[PDB]
Amino acid sequence: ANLWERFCNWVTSTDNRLYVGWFGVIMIPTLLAATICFVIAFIAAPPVDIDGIREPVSGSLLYGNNIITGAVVPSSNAIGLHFYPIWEAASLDEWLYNGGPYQLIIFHFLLGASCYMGRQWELSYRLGMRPWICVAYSAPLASAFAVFLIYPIGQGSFSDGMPLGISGTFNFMIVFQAEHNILMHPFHQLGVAGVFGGALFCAMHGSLVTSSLIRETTETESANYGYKFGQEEETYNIVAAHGYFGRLIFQYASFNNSRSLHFFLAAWPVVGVWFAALGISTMAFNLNGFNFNHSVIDAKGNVINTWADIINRANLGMEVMHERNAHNFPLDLA
Amino acid sequence: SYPIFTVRWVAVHTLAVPTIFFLGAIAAMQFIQR
Amino acid sequence: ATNRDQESSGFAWWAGNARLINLSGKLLGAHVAHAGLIVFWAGAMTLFELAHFIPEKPMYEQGLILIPHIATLGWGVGPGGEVVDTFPFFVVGVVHLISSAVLGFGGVYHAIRGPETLEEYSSFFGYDWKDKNKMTTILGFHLIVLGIGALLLVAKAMFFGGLYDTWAPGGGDVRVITNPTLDPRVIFGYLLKSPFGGEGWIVSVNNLEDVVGGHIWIGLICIAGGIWHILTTPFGWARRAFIWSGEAYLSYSLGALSMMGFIATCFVWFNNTVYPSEFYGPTGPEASQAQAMTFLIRDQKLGANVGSAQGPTGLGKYLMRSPTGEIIFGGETMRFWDFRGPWLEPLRGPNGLDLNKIKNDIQPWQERRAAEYMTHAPLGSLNSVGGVATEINSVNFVSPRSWLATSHFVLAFFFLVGHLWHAGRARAAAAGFEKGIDRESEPVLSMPSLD
Amino acid sequence: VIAQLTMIAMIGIAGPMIIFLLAVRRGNL
Amino acid sequence: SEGGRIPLWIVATVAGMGVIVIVGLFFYGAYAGLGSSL
Amino acid sequence: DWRVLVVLLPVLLAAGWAVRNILPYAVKQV
Amino acid sequence: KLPEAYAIFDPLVDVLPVIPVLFLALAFVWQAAVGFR
Amino acid sequence: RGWFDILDDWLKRDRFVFVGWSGILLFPCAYLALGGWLTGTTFVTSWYTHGLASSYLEGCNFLTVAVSTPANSMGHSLLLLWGPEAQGDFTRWCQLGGLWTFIALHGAFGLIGFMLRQFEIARLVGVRPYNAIAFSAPIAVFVSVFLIYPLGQSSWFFAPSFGVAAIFRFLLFFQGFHNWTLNPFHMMGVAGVLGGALLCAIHGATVENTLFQDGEGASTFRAFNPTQAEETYSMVTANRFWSQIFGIAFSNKRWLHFFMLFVPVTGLWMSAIGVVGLALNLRSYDFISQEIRAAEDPEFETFYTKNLLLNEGIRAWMAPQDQPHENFVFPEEVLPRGNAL
Amino acid sequence: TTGERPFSDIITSVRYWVIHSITIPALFIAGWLFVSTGLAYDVFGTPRPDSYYAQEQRSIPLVTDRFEAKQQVETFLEQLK
Amino acid sequence: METITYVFIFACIIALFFFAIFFREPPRIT
Ligand code: CLA
Ligand code: CLA
Ligand code: CLA
Ligand code: CLA
Ligand code: CLA
Ligand SMILES: CC1=C(/C=C/C(C)=C/C=C/C(C)=C/C=C/C=C(C)/C=C/C=C(C)/C=C/C2=C(C)CCCC2(C)C)C(C)(C)CCC1
Ligand SMILES: CC1=C(/C=C/C(C)=C/C=C/C(C)=C/C=C/C=C(C)/C=C/C=C(C)/C=C/C2=C(C)CCCC2(C)C)C(C)(C)CCC1
Ligand SMILES: CC1=C(/C=C/C(C)=C/C=C/C(C)=C/C=C/C=C(C)/C=C/C=C(C)/C=C/C2=C(C)CCCC2(C)C)C(C)(C)CCC1
Ligand SMILES: CC1=C(/C=C/C(C)=C/C=C/C(C)=C/C=C/C=C(C)/C=C/C=C(C)/C=C/C2=C(C)CCCC2(C)C)C(C)(C)CCC1
Ligand code: OEX
Ligand SMILES: [Ca+2]
Ligand SMILES: [Ca+2]
Numbered sequence A: 001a002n003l004w005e006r007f008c009n010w011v012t013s014t015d016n017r018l019y020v021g022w023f024g025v026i027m028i029p030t031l032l033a034a035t036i037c038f039v040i041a042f043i044a045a046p047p048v049d050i051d052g053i054r055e056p057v058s059g060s061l062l063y064g065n066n067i068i069t070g071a072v073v074p075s076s077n078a079i080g081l082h083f084y085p086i087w088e089a090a091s092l093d094e095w096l097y098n099g100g101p102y103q104l105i106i107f108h109f110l111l112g113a114s115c116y117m118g119r120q121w122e123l124s125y126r127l128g129m130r131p132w133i134c135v136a137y138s139a140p141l142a143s144a145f146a147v148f149l150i151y152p153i154g155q156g157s158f159s160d161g162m163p164l165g166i167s168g169t170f171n172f173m174i175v176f177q178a179e180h181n182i183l184m185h186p187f188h189q190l191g192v193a194g195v196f197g198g199a200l201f202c203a204m205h206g207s208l209v210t211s212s213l214i215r216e217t218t219e220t221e222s223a224n225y226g227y228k229f230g231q232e233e234e235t236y237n238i239v240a241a242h243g244y245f246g247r248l249i250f251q252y253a254s255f256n257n258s259r260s261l262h263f264f265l266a267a268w269p270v271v272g273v274w275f276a277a278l279g280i281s282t283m284a285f286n287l288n289g290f291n292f293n294h295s296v297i298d299a300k301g302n303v304i305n306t307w308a309d310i311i312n313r314a315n316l317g318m319e320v321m322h323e324r325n326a327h328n329f330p331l332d333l334a
Numbered sequence B: 001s002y003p004i005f006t007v008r009w010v011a012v013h014t015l016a017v018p019t020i021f022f023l024g025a026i027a028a029m030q031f032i033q034r
Numbered sequence C: 001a002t003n004r005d006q007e008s009s010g011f012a013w014w015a016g017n018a019r020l021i022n023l024s025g026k027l028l029g030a031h032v033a034h035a036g037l038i039v040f041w042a043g044a045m046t047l048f049e050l051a052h053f054i055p056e057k058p059m060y061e062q063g064l065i066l067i068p069h070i071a072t073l074g075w076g077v078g079p080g081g082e083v084v085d086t087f088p089f090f091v092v093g094v095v096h097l098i099s100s101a102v103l104g105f106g107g108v109y110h111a112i113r114g115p116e117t118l119e120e121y122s123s124f125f126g127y128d129w130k131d132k133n134k135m136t137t138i139l140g141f142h143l144i145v146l147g148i149g150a151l152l153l154v155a156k157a158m159f160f161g162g163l164y165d166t167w168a169p170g171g172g173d174v175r176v177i178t179n180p181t182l183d184p185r186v187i188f189g190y191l192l193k194s195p196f197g198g199e200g201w202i203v204s205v206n207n208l209e210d211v212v213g214g215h216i217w218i219g220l221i222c223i224a225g226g227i228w229h230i231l232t233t234p235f236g237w238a239r240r241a242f243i244w245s246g247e248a249y250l251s252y253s254l255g256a257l258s259m260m261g262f263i264a265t266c267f268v269w270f271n272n273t274v275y276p277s278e279f280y281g282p283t284g285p286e287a288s289q290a291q292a293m294t295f296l297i298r299d300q301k302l303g304a305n306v307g308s309a310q311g312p313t314g315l316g317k318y319l320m321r322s323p324t325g326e327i328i329f330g331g332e333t334m335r336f337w338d339f340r341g342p343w344l345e346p347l348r349g350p351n352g353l354d355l356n357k358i359k360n361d362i363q364p365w366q367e368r369r370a371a372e373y374m375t376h377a378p379l380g381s382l383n384s385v386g387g388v389a390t391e392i393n394s395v396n397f398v399s400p401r402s403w404l405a406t407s408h409f410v411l412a413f414f415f416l417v418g419h420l421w422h423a424g425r426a427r428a429a430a431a432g433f434e435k436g437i438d439r440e441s442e443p444v445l446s447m448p449s450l451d
Numbered sequence D: 001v002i003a004q005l006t007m008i009a010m011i012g013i014a015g016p017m018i019i020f021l022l023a024v025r026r027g028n029l
Numbered sequence E: 001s002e003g004g005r006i007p008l009w010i011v012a013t014v015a016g017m018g019v020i021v022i023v024g025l026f027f028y029g030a031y032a033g034l035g036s037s038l
Numbered sequence F: 001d002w003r004v005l006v007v008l009l010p011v012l013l014a015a016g017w018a019v020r021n022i023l024p025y026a027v028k029q030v
Numbered sequence G: 001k002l003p004e005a006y007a008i009f010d011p012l013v014d015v016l017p018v019i020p021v022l023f024l025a026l027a028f029v030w031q032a033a034v035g036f037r
Numbered sequence H: 001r002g003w004f005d006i007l008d009d010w011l012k013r014d015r016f017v018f019v020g021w022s023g024i025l026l027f028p029c030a031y032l033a034l035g036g037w038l039t040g041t042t043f044v045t046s047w048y049t050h051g052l053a054s055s056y057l058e059g060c061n062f063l064t065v066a067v068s069t070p071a072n073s074m075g076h077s078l079l080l081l082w083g084p085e086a087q088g089d090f091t092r093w094c095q096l097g098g099l100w101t102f103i104a105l106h107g108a109f110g111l112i113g114f115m116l117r118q119f120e121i122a123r124l125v126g127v128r129p130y131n132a133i134a135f136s137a138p139i140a141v142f143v144s145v146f147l148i149y150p151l152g153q154s155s156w157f158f159a160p161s162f163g164v165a166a167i168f169r170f171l172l173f174f175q176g177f178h179n180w181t182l183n184p185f186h187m188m189g190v191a192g193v194l195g196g197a198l199l200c201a202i203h204g205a206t207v208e209n210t211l212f213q214d215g216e217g218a219s220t221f222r223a224f225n226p227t228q229a230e231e232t233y234s235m236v237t238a239n240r241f242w243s244q245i246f247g248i249a250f251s252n253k254r255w256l257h258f259f260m261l262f263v264p265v266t267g268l269w270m271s272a273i274g275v276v277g278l279a280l281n282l283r284s285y286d287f288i289s290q291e292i293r294a295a296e297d298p299e300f301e302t303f304y305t306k307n308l309l310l311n312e313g314i315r316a317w318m319a320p321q322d323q324p325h326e327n328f329v330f331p332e333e334v335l336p337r338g339n340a341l
Numbered sequence I: 001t002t003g004e005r006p007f008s009d010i011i012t013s014v015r016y017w018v019i020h021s022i023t024i025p026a027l028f029i030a031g032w033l034f035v036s037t038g039l040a041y042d043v044f045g046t047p048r049p050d051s052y053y054a055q056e057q058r059s060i061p062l063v064t065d066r067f068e069a070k071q072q073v074e075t076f077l078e079q080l081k
Numbered sequence J: 001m002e003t004i005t006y007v008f009i010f011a012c013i014i015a016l017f018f019f020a021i022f023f024r025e026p027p028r029i030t
C-alpha cells in the first residue's frame, strides 16, 4: 500500500488508544490551540477592554484574580463582530488589550467541539454501532454555540458572548435576565425541566437498578464485584425494579421495557437542553420572555402588582447598573 | 364481573371532581371585566 | 393494506412515513399533498394579513411577513414604500389558495387511490433510489425548474415593473432594473467575502443590480447543471464518496436546508436591501444607530458641539473613531458602525460621518426616520409587548425581523439535528447495522484490546 | 365573532368526519 | 352497559378537542378582561 | 346564603342522578 | 382589508391559516382509528 | 391474626394504587398540599400580605399565580386555622396567608409519607431501599429552603412563595442579597444537577446505540423481553467506544448505576448546606482581598466587582415593593444607576 | 392486573357516558356559578376590582400586627366605606 | 503563593487525566 493509503488506515484505525479519524484530524489541533491559549491567558493575560470604553477588565490569575473571579475576557465592543486574529493587531500588546485571546479560543473551540461530535458519529460507524450518541451530544454543543457565537451575532458584538470564567458566566446570566427576562421564557423553562428532570431521572434510574442488583457477593465485599465486564447476563432484575416502581406510583406509569426506558433517559434532557439552546439563540434576536408588567389593573386603573412586577423591579436594578459607563442614550438597544 | 366502587375509584374522583368544578370557575373568570 | 403496520413494514406508527421509502406512488402523494400544504399556508396567510391590514400603518406595526415579501417585489407600493394598491396582495393570496386545492387533489389521489408504486406503471416516473442515473436525472429536472424560478425574479425586475429599491435616488421607490451586474468578479466576489463584521459574505449585497445579476447567473448555472445531470451519471470518485439510498439523499438535503435556514436568519437580521426596512422595520444595528442620530440631532439643536463633546469614558459622547479611523456614532452603538442605510448615508463622507454635513445638512425627514427606527427597534416580548424587557405594557409590537430570524434559527437547528439523525442512520443501514449489533458477530470482540 | 367559531367548528369537524364515515363504511383506513 | 361500545379513538378525539377549546378560552382571557393590561 | 344553594344545586343534582343510576349495582355490590 | 364584496367572508378568512395544523392532528385521529398498528 | 394484622392485610393489598401504612400519612397530606396550592392559586389574593394579586380570580395567569407567604408581621407563626391570628375564621385565615403554612407543613409531612412509602414498598417487594435513600435529597432541599431558611430569617415572609414567577423572584432575591451564585455549595449543587442531566443523557443514548439486534424490526423497542436473561446492549462495545472517544469509560454496570444515584443526590445535599448558611445571612458574598485592592485602586476591575454592582442595583430597585413591611422610601437621587439608564 | 375494571372498558361504555354527560357538566356549571354569583370573593376574602383601594387611597392595606391582624383586615375593609 | 497554588492544583489534575487514561487498569472480559 502507498503512503497515503497507510496514513488513511492509521487515521481511521479502530485500534488506536484514542480514535483519531478525519474529524479528529481537525479536532486535535484546534482543541490543542484553544486549550493552550486558554491556559496561558487565564494565568497571565493583561486586562481587556471588554466594552470598548477604555475600561480594561482584569481576568487572569497573575493580575489579581482567583479561580472563581478569573476569566478570559470577551473581545472589545469596538471590534463588534469583526474578525480579529493575531495578525490583524499591530502587536501582541494591542491584541491582548483588545481581547484577541477570547476570539482565538472560542473559534478554535467551537470548530473542535463540532468535530468532536462528528468524531462520535465516526467511531460509532467504525465499531458497528448505531449512530445517535452524537445527536445527544448536539444538545450541549448547541448550547455552547448559543452563548459563544449566536448571541454575539444577534447582539452585534463578541463583547456580549459568554466570558470564559466562573464569575464572568454569572455576569452573562444576570445581564441576560435584565435584557431578555429569560426566566419568563418558556424555552428556558423547558431547559430547566430538562436538567432538573435529567437529574431526577438520573437518580431514579441509578437507585432502581442499584435496588435490584442480584445477590452475587458477601457483606464484606463491594456489590460491584458481583458484575463482571462483558458478562452476557444482565446484572439486575428489571422485573423486580418495575414491580417496585409500578407499585410506587401505579403500574402503567412505569417502564417494563429497558430500551424504551433508556430512550426516555436520553430524550428528556436532550430535548429540554435543545430548547434551552434555542432559547438563548432566539433571545439572541430579542424575542424575549413573557412580559406581564402591569398586566393586572383594578376598576379605577390602579396597577395591582403581581410577582411578575417584582421580577421586573429586580431586572430594573440589573439593567440600570450593568456596564455603568457604557451607555450615553436612554435605551439599551443592544 | 368487576366492582365499581374501589380505592382506585375514590382516588380518581377526589382528583377529578374538584378539577372539573375548578375548570368551570376559571372559565367563568375569563369573562370578568374590571 | 400493504406495509401499513409494524409487523410487515418493520416501522412503528411513530415512524410510519418510513413505510413510504420504496412506494414511489404513495410517496409522490405525500410530497404533492405537502406542497399543497405549503401553498395553502401562503395563500391563506396572505388573505389573513390583507384582511387585518391598515394601509396607513407601517407594515411592521401589524405583524405582517408575507405582504412585505410581495411589496419588496414592487407590487402594491409607491415612493417610500407607501401602499398605493392592495389588490396585488389579494391576487397573490387568492391564486396561491386556489392552487393549493389542485396540489391537494393530486396529493390525495396519488396517496390513497393511484398506483402505490410507479415503476410497473411508468418507466419515466418510476425510480430506484440506487439508480444513480435516474436520481441525477430527476435532480436535473428540478434544477431546471429552480433556474426558471430565479429567471422569473429577473424578469419581474427587468420587464414587469421592477423591484422596490430602498436606495433609489430621491428616496425609496419601485425601479426597473436595466443594467444588472453580469461581471463574475463582483457576483462570485460576494461569495468569497468573509462572513465576519464589516464584510458579511453574501448577506452584504446592497444594491438591486447585484441581486438581479446574481439571479441571472444562478438561473443559467441551475439550468446548465440540470441538463448536465440529466445527461450524465455520477463519476467514480462521487460513487465512492457517497451513500446511495433514499434516507441518504434526504439527509443531504436536510443539511442543505439547515445551512439555508441559518443564512436566511442572518439575511433578515442584517440586510435592509432585499428586506427593506420600510416593510420589515429597522434592523437591530439600524435602530441603535438611529438612537445615536436622534440624540445627536436633539443636543446639537440645543447648542451642543457634537464633534468635540467628550463623553464620560473619554470617548466622544456622540462621535468617535472606528478601529480603522472612520468617524462613527459613539456609545454602545460603536459596535454597529458597519451599518449602512438610505437615511444615514447622506451624512457620510470619505472618512465616515462628516461633521460639516452633520452640522448643516440634516433634513427633517432624516430626523423623522431616525426617530421612527429608534422607536421600532427589534426588541419585544413573546406576548408582543414592544420594547426592552423591563418596559410596561402599552405598545403591541414585535419586529418581523425578530419573528423571521428566530423562527428560521429554530427550524435550521432542528434541520441540522435531522441531518445528523438521517445521515448516521443512512450510513448504518447501508452498512447493515442500523437495527443493532449481531451478537454472534460483534465487531469489537474481533479487535485487539486497547490495553 | 360567532361566525369564526362556527367556521372552525365546521372545518374542525370536517377532519374527524372523514375518518368516521370511512370507519363506518369499512373503508380503506 | 357493555364496554367498547364507543370507539376509543372517538373518545380521544372529542376529549382532545375539549382540551384545546378550554385552553383556547384561557388564552383568549389573556387578551380580554382582567390580566389583559388594558 | 342563596348563592351556595344556587352553586351547589348542580353538584347535588349530579350526585342524586348517579346515585339513582348506580343504585342497583351498588346494592348488588354491598 | 379585503375588497368590500368579500367582507362577508372575514370570519372564514380569520380561521384559514390554522387549517394546515389540523392536518397534523388529523394524522393522529386516523392513527387512533387503526389502533396505531 | 387480630385487628392489627387484619388492617395490615387490607393496607397492603395489591390494588391499582397501593396504600400501605405509609399511605395513611401520605395521601391526606399530599392531597391537602396539592389541593391547597390549586385552591390558593385559583381563588386567593396576596393583597394583605404582599400587596399582590396572585390568583386566576384576580387575573393572574399560570406563570404569575402563587400561594404567597404570610406578612412579615406574622413572624414564624404556625398560623393554624384555630390559632390566635385567624381564630377559626377561614376567610381571614386565607387573607393572612394561612394557606402558605398549610401547604408547607402538609407538604413536609407528605414528603415524609412518600419516602416511607418507598421504604414500605421496597420491603414488600424484596428490593434494597436505595430509591428512598436517593429521595433524601428532595427532602433536604425542601426542608432547607422552605423551613430552615425562613426560620433563620425574620419570618415566613422570606420563604419561597408557591408559584412560578414567585420562585423566579426567590432566585433573583438570592442573587441580589446573598450573591448565591458565588457560593461553593450552590456550585456543587449545579455540578450535581448538570452532571446528573449529562449522565442521564449519555447513559440513555449509549444504551440505545449499543443495542444488540434482537429482532428484525427497524423500530427496535419490541426486540426486548423484561424476563430475558441477556443484556440488551453491549457493555464491551460501549466501553471501547467511550474509551476511545473520551479516554475513560465505565466497565462496571453496578458502579455506573450507583454513580448515577450518587451525583445528583450529593449535589442537592450540598446546595442544602449552602441554603442553611443563607438562613443566617452566612453568605459567600465577598472575597476580602478583592475588596481591599478595589477600594484602594480605582482601576482594578474584575467580573466579581461587576456582579456586585448588579447586586446593588437589584437590592435598591426591588426592596421597596418586595419588602413592603419595611416602608422603604428611596428618593430618586439615591437610586444607584449607571450613565443614561 | 389488580382486580379493578380496565379504564378502556369504562370510558368507552355507554353507561359511563350516561352518568358523566350529566355529572361533568353539572360540576363545571357549579364552579362557573361559584364565580359568576360572586360567592368565591366572599368565601376567600379576595378583593373585587373595585375593592383593592378606597377612591383616593394609594396605600396597600398591609397587615402589620400579628395578633390583631384579623381586626386590622376588618378595619381595612370598613375603610372602603 | 495563591497563583502558584491554583496553577499547581490544576497541573496535578492534568497529570491525573494522563494517568487515568494511559495507565488505567485495563478492562478485561470474563
Ligand atoms: C404532511 C403530513 C403527512 C402526509 C402528506 C402523510 C402521507 C401518508 N402517510 Mg403519514 N404520518 C404523518 C404525516 C403525513 N403522512 C404523521 C404526522 C404521522 C404520525 C401520526 C404519520 C404516521 C403514518 C403511518 C403509521 C402510516 C402513514 C402512511 C401515509 C401514506 C398512506 C396514508 C393512508 O393510506 O391512509 C388512509 C387514510 C384514510 C383513508 C383517511 C383519509 C385520508 C385522506 C388523505 C384525508 C384527506 C383530507 C383532505 C382535506 C381532503 C381534501 C380533498 C380535496 C383536495 C378535494 C401517505 C402517503 C401509511 C403508509 O406509509 O402506507 C404505505 C402508514 O402506514 N403515516
Ligand atoms: C424534509 C424533512 C424531513 C422528512 C421528509 C423526514 C422523514 C422521516 N423522518 Mg425525519 N427528521 C427531520 C426531518 C424530516 N424527516 C427533522 C428536522 C428532525 C429533527 C427533529 C427529524 C428527526 C427524526 C427522528 C428522531 C426520526 C425521524 C424519522 C423519519 C422517517 C419517519 C417519519 C415519521 O413517520 O414521523 C411521524 C410524525 C410524527 C410522529 C409527528 C411528530 C410530532 C412533531 C414532533 C410535532 C412538532 C411540533 C409542531 C411543529 C408544533 C406543535 C403543533 C401542535 C400544537 C399541533 C421519515 C423518513 C424516523 C426514522 O428514523 O425513520 C427511518 C425517526 O425515528 N426523523
Ligand atoms: C415561518 C414561520 C412563521 C413566522 C416567522 C410567523 C410570524 C408571525 N405570525 Mg404566523 N403563522 C405561521 C408561521 C409563522 N408565523 C403558521 C405555521 C401559522 C398557522 C398556525 C400562522 C398563522 C398565524 C395567525 C392566525 C397569526 C399569525 C401571526 C404572526 C405574527 C405574530 C406571531 C406570534 O404572536 O406568535 C406567538 C408565538 C407562539 C405561538 C410560539 C410558537 C412556538 C412553537 C410552537 C415552538 C415550535 C418548536 C419546534 C417547531 C417544535 C419541534 C419539536 C421538537 C421536539 C423537534 C408574527 C409576525 C399573528 C398576526 O399578527 O397576524 C397579522 C396572527 O394572528 N400567524
Ligand atoms: C408534481 C408532481 C407530480 C408527478 C411526478 C405526477 C405523476 C403522475 N401523475 Mg399526477 N397529479 C399531480 C402531480 C404529479 N403527478 C397533480 C398536481 C394532480 C392534480 C391535477 C395530479 C392528479 C393526477 C391524476 C388524476 C392522475 C395522475 C397520474 C400521474 C401519472 C401519469 C402522468 C402522465 O402521464 O401525464 C402526462 C403529462 C401531461 C399530460 C402534461 C402535463 C402538463 C402540465 C400539467 C402543465 C403544467 C406544467 C407546469 C410545470 C406546472 C407547474 C405546477 C407548479 C407551479 C406547482 C404520473 C405518475 C395518472 C395516474 O397516476 O394513472 C394511474 C392519473 O390518472 N395525476
Ligand atoms: C441541487 C444542487 C446539486 C446537487 C445536489 C448536485 C449533486 C452532484 N453533482 Mg452537480 N451541479 C449542480 C447542482 C447540483 N449537483 C449545478 C448547478 C452545476 C453547474 C454548476 C453542477 C455541475 C456538476 C459537475 C461538473 C459535477 C457535478 C457532480 C455532482 C455529484 C457529485 C458532487 C459532489 O461530490 O459534491 C460535493 C462537493 C465537493 C466535493 C466540492 C469540494 C468540497 C469543498 C470543500 C466544498 C466547500 C464548499 C463550502 C462549504 C461552501 C460555502 C460557500 C463557498 C462558495 C465558499 C453529485 C450527484 C459531479 C458528478 O459526479 O457529475 C456526474 C461532477 O463532476 N455537478
Ligand atoms: C395524504 C395524507 C395526509 C395529508 C393530506 C393532506 C396534507 C392533504 C392536503 C390537502 C389540501 C392542501 C387541500 C386544499 C384545499 C383547498 C381548498 C378546498 C380551497 C378552496 C378555496 C376557496 C373556496 C376560496 C374561496 C375564496 C375566494 C375564491 C375569494 C377570496 C375569499 C375566499 C377565501 C372565500 C394525512 C396527514 C391526513 C394522513 C393520511 C395521508
Ligand atoms: C443569487 C444572488 C447572488 C449569487 C449567488 C451565487 C452565485 C451563489 C453561488 C453559490 C455556490 C456556488 C454555492 C456552492 C455551495 C457548495 C457547497 C455547499 C458544497 C458542499 C460540499 C459538501 C457537502 C461535501 C462534503 C464532503 C466532503 C467535504 C468530503 C468528501 C465527502 C463529502 C462529499 C461528503 C449574489 C450573492 C451575487 C447576490 C444576491 C443574489
Ligand atoms: C380553504 C377553504 C376550505 C378548506 C377547508 C379544509 C381543507 C379543511 C380541512 C380540515 C381538516 C383537515 C380538519 C381536521 C381536524 C382534525 C382534528 C380536529 C383532530 C383533532 C385531534 C385530536 C384532538 C387528537 C386527539 C388524540 C388522539 C386522537 C389520540 C392521541 C391522543 C390525543 C388526545 C392527542 C373550505 C372547504 C372550508 C372552503 C373555504 C376555503
Ligand atoms: C385547601 C384546604 C382544604 C382542601 C381543599 C382541596 C383538597 C381542594 C382541591 C382542589 C383541587 C384538586 C383542584 C383541582 C384543580 C385542577 C385544575 C384547575 C386543572 C387545570 C388543568 C389544566 C389547565 C391543564 C393544563 C394542561 C396541562 C397541565 C398539560 C397538557 C396541556 C394542558 C394545557 C391542557 C380543606 C377543605 C381540607 C381545608 C381548608 C384548606
Ligand atoms: O455590551 Mn454587554 O450589555 Ca448587551 O445591552 Mn447594551 O450592550 Mn452592553 O448594554 Mn446592555
Ligand atoms: Ca368597570
Ligand atoms: Ca442522469
Ligand SMILES: [Cl-]
Pocket: A171, A175, A321, A322, A323, H306
Ligand atoms: Cl456588567
Ligand SMILES: [Cl-]
Pocket: A326, A327, A328, A329, C330, C331, C332, C333
Ligand atoms: Cl449608548
Ligand SMILES: [Fe+2]
Pocket: A205, A209, H203, H207
Ligand atoms: Fe441503565
Ligand SMILES: [Mg+2]
Pocket: B029, B030, B031, E028, E029, E030, E031, E032, E033, E034, E035, E036, H059
Ligand atoms: Mg382575562
